[PDB]
Design a protein around this nucleic acid. Sequence first.
RNA 1: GCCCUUCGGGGCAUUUGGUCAAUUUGAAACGAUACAGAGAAGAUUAGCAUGGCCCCUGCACUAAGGAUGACACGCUACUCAAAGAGACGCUACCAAUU
Length: 148
Amino acid sequence: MPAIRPASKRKPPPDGFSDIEEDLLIFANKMKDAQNTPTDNIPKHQAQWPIFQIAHQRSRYVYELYYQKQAISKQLYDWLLKNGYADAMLIAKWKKQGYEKLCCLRCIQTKETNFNSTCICRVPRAQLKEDQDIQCVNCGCRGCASTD
RNA sequence: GCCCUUCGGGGCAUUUGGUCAAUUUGAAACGAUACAGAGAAGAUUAGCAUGGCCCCUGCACUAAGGAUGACACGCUACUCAAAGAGACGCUACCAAUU
Ligand SMILES: [Zn+2]
Ligand SMILES: [Zn+2]
Ligand SMILES: [Zn+2]
């Protein structure tokens, strides 16, 4: 379970976890530092942006470690997705076509916008104004479209 | 970026949003202090209401309480006369002790 077991109850992870544990702990400590970041000098949605950034990065590490540069077994990959080292739904969207670089699921959630739209970060920057710096309110993405 | 191609081309995906993170000048309120100071025609007071540009506590916007919760207590011509009886009214002002 992803609930914390005592120690004697703890089952070992699969093989290769000793090989990837250092990068996984790098992402975990990055996430704790994002928890401890100050919020006085920035706005509030901007305070929540780094969690989405680090979650995307951790899931991308797992995703391209399994699919692109094959370095982990399928047992280990399924274990990582089950135990919370990567976002299975974000990885599913990365497998979809036209969503190969999606920042977050909240940015394609169309039931939650005013006019049932995706966010502006999903729009190909070829159709936007020049020097129109987008940083979306949801995660601060500057451009996710696969063409971008 | 990926995919397809008859290598000319075509496809997949499509417009977020919370006035800034900044406290003097776009609106918080007690308490302390100062002061005064509790209804019903003598004195003392159980209350229940009434009306709303007065509200408070309460789930009660179909209880109850808040001094009977308070407020009430100033002010005061205006649909408006008639009868009969008066008026040096409406003008003048005036000549003997012995
Ligand atoms: Zn996003
Ligand atoms: Zn976005
Ligand atoms: Zn994005």
